[PDB]
């Protein structure tokens, strides 16, 4: 689950709005997780794409299929807006809840690896 | 004689058993690791069971 | 008598018996070495009035966690043709017991390629990792090990 | 093949012949020699380690058999062919920790 | 799977499913259809399996097939004893072993 | 397991002490049948039997959760030993 | 709107049963709990314990019979024995034989209420003088019980067999995309059942849905708390 | 035979219940169905489409508030409202505020139907001569669809928003062995249930087993084709 996903088919494409990315993520012209530059940021696919407020959605699109737990997105997570995995939340969470405290839970997991 | 065994003295078994532990060794015994303290629990099976963490 | 089903004439079980551990195969009477109940031995004795009796029970019965069907006999006695029996020994008695085993847990299992194994525990066909066919699979081993 | 056949677990025709009858005790053969040899079938013999050591026949009655042709196999032979274990249907994989 | 067409059945989707992540990961070529994609996977040894406990297909494909395997001497019936007060040694007081 | 043992661990500077005492404590406690206890009848360790939820018979773990509260007090040449079993008896038949 | 379904049978032994359209992923939702039950608890025959006049015990040698005892109740196990009479739950299957015949299945002495669904099933090979006299007691119930549970002493020499009950074979159930929505994304959940023929694929299902459906409503009126 | 059912309910928010004891494998059973379910199923809540005043994109800032225009999208993600009447499949929430404020869900300008269970919420933070208009637009909907499956503009430049429907926030069942007597080989079946308080955890476990008997109450009429 900790382990991310990195596809070579998008291959650091440029697009000026996200919405040239997005039609070509359509298409089948750039990966989802592959590393890609919007605007002048550097971003994935997925990142743009599937943007959670809180864990539980993330986890809910994902269990319905249409996200995997090893993707690059953009999720709401204890007060902080990370670019990281569902599944990784998942272990944050999976630890948290544990140990019983989520916040110290965080302060001692490396949800960098 | 006649293992007549009913639930009763399972329920009984499971009476003077509940808080107790037993210890557990596997030879060669290196550490003082090599025995552990661990509970019965009555289940159906000639073999022993064991937590997968304590096996290293 | 409850014990004694299966014993039928000499005291030795029948073909095609089951023997419960604590059951008696061949009944066997040897006189005790004779010696005084003690005080309170003598008073349950004397209460049931049971008379104690020279001979006790040194019956063979089949050892704890080994039971079966009996299918062999051989009885060999002294004094009788084709058999020469050790000094002090009447006659020896020997019983063939067949059991049968299922694949339990626990049990060891193996393949030509050396990997080891221990059946863990068994699973019902309900829940198993199956083919689009419905097709089951066997065993389920694990990738780790080789 | 050989495994199971220089064994010796395992009943063969020692000439040619035809199988007169089988059942699990005795199957007779009248070979070509003209004499009839029945072959005794051993049935779950105790082992040293235990294991039971038993002859399956495999013929029909009235088939005119070649020589050194099977008979009956052993414990561990199945059609001549040694017989350890099964074959089973095996996935590879991790379940639950089990 | 030429028996599966015969009797009236399509690629199930959950296998579609299998062979997307499995086409993600590069497991089978892409642009190709789902019935090529089973088929590379199935030279591979991996097919698509399904979870009896839940009816979902695993994420990645497994290999299955016949293997011939072994039961042997130990056995848990023959192996498993426990004692509580028994006979002792005469010599020394130690139980038997 | 056997819950808050870390806090017994700090109620003492050797553990071998604390096992000593859950040990001592174990032992009145089945010398006069639990009715030395320190415990309420909410506090008690119960059991669970489909019968009913009982006493739980082990001493060792009411010996724990006796420690657990607090109420006892422990250590070296506290009270003569002689006067603490006679008393001891004396209190509880 | 309302699912149409269609059942498509084949003997008793087969069936298919298509149940389209529906919601996404709901036909896993439905298909594998119905094969767990159908494959588990789905009440069964196949006898119980078996008697051959000479024989004292399973591994006994039938003059005779060039089959022992335990390949012969190994076949017996594959016996599939019918009921007609739901309210029979016991029966004995008498079957007698002689001469230089074949022993199948379907030699057995017939009785009312029973019936064999393969009487092309080998039994045992019978040689010059072999005479076999045979009594299957047959029971019914559900699941899978060994003979080392179960016993029996209906008379000295009884043997307990082995007993596979349930009647379904193998179930598989297969989900598609269907052409039958107002949109995408829907499924088709088509069931296969593999039966024995004791019990038709399609009773095995209704008494499948009926179970599921009992132990569904065992969720109620519970008991509440407030920690 | 007949199995305990045990509910231990937290606020409208959580809830656990405990189904035992039963039989093997009618744990998982009914296990991931309803789990199944309770995430794809029960109707519900959640806002579609947001339109926002002097902001015609998705990514760009609004002067006069901290948040940017994803973070108040977020927040209206995790708003939550009730219809009070079922004839209303829509409506539309408007906000308006000025100057230095905290801006809540509280301070969201009501409607006739349409009730906020969560009053206290953080929307936006309004600074010194913030001006801020926005109009959202709830729709009623099931399970979860995504801003890409439908993209709304009723509005010039409105923004659409993922919509999660469910009111389920989140599952995670388990199962146990449990003993009774002998056998020590039962299923307790443990259903965790998280909710965001539209509905308590036990109105939608129930409503979720009432769809699942609805759809096994869909195996009727058999239509036969034999191949």
């Keep these: 689950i900790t382990q991310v996903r990195k596809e070579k088919k998008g291959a650091g494409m440029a697009f000026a709005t996200p919405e040239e990315a997005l039609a070509a993520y359509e298409r089948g012209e750039v990966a989802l997780n592959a590393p890609i530059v919007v605007a002048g940021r550097e971003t994935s696919v997925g990142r743009l794409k599937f943007v959670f407020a809180n864990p539980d959605e993330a986890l809910l699109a994902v269990a319905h299929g249409l996200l995997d737990l090893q993707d690059v997105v953009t999720v709401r997570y204890l007060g902080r807006r990370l670019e990281t995995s569902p599944g990784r939340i998942l272990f944050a969470r999976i630890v948290g809840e544990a140990v019983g405290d989520e916040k110290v839970a965080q302060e001692l997991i490396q949800m960098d690896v | 004689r006649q293992r007549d065994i009913k639930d009763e003295v399972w329920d009984a078994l499971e009476e003077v058993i509940h808080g107790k532990v037993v210890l557990l060794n596997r030879a060669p015994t290196l550490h003082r690791l090599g025995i552990q303290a661990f509970q019965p629990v009555l289940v159906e099976g000639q073999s022993i069971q064991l937590h997968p963490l304590v096996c290293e | 008598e409850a014990a004694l089903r299966d014993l039928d004439e000499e005291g030795i079980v029948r073909i095609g018996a089951e023997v419960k551990p604590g059951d008696i195969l061949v009944g066997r009477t040897s006189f005790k070495g004779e010696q005084e109940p003690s005080p309170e031995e003598r008073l349950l004795r004397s209460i049931f009035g049971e008379k104690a009796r020279d001979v006790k029970d040194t019956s063979l019965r089949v050892p704890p966690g080994e039971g079966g069907i009996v299918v062999g006999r051989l009885r060999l006695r002294r004094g009788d043709p084709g058999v020469e029996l050790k000094p002090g020994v009447r006659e020896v008695v020997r019983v063939f017991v067949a059991q049968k085993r299922k694949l339990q847990v626990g049990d060891k299992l193996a393949n030509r390629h050396g990997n080891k194994g221990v059946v863990a525990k068994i699973l019902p066909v309900e829940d198993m990792p199956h083919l689009p066919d419905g097709t089951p699979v066997d065993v389920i081993l694990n990738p780790l090990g080789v | ?98 | 799977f030429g028996k599966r067409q015969g009797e009236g059945f399509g690629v199930d989707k959950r296998e579609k499913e299998v062979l997307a992540r499995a086409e993600k990961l590069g497991l089978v070529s892409p642009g190709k259809s789902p019935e090529e994609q089973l088929k590379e996977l199935f030279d591979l040894g991996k097919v698509v399996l399904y979870d009896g406990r839940t009816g979902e297909p695993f994420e990645g494909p497994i290999v299955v097939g016949q293997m011939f395997i072994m039961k042997l001497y130990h056995m848990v019936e023959d192996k498993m004893h426990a004692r509580s007060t028994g006979p002792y040694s005469l010599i020394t007081q130690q139980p038997l072993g | 397991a056997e819950p808050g043992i870390d806090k017994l661990f700090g109620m003492v500077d050797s553990k071998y002490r604390l096992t000593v005492v859950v040990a001592k404590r174990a032992q009145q406690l089945l010398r006069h049948r639990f009715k030395n206890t320190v415990l309420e009848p909410e506090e008690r360790p119960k059991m669970r039997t489909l019968e009913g939820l009982y006493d739980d018979p082990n001493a060792v773990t009411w010996a724990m959760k006796e420690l657990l509260t607090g109420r006892l007090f422990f250590g070296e040449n506290l009270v003569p030993e002689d006067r603490l079993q006679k008393e001891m008896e004396r209190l509880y038949p | 709107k309302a699912p149409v379904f269609t059942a498509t049978t084949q003997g008793d032994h087969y069936g298919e049963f298509v149940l389209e359209p529906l919601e996404r992923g709901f036909g896993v939702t439905l298909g594998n709990p119905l094969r767990r039950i159908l494959l588990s608890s789905i009440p069964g025959t196949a006898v119980t314990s078996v008697y051959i006049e000479d024989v004292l015990h399973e591994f006994s040698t039938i003059p005779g019979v060039k089959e022992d005892v335990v390949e012969i109740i190994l076949n017996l196990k594959e016996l599939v024995v019918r009921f007609l009479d739901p309210k029979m739950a016991s029966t004995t299957l008498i079957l007698r034989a002689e001469g230089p015949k074949e022993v199948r299945a379907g030699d057995f002495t017939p009785s009312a209420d029973v019936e064999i669904m393969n009487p092309d099933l080998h039994i045992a090979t019978l040689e010059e003088g072999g005479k076999l006299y045979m009594e299957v007691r047959v029971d019914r119930g559900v699941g899978y019980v060994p003979a080392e549970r179960h016993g029996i002493k209906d008379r000295i020499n009884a043997i307990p067999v082995d007993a596979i009950f349930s009647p379904v074979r193998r179930v598989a159930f297969q989900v598609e995309d269907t052409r039958l929505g107002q949109r995408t994304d829907l499924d088709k959940l088509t069931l296969r059942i593999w039966t024995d023929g004791s019990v038709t694929p399609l009773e095995a299902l209704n008494q499948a849905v009926a179970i599921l459906k009992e132990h569904l409503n065992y969720f109620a009126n519970p008991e509440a708390s407030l920690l």
């Design chain 4, 1 to 98: 093949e050989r495994v199971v056949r220089d064994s010796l677990a395992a009943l063969y025709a020692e000439e040619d012949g035809e199988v007169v009858k089988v059942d699990g005790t005795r199957i007779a053969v009248r070979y070509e020699d003209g004499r009839l040899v029945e072959h005794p079938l051993r049935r779950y013999a105790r082992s040293n380690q235990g294991t039971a050591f038993d002859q399956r026949p495999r013929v029909r009655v009235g088939q005119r058999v070649k020589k050194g042709d099977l008979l009956a196999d052993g414990p561990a032979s199945e059609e001549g062919f040694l017989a350890l274990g099964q074959n089973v249907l095996v996935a590879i994989m991790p379940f639950d920790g089990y």
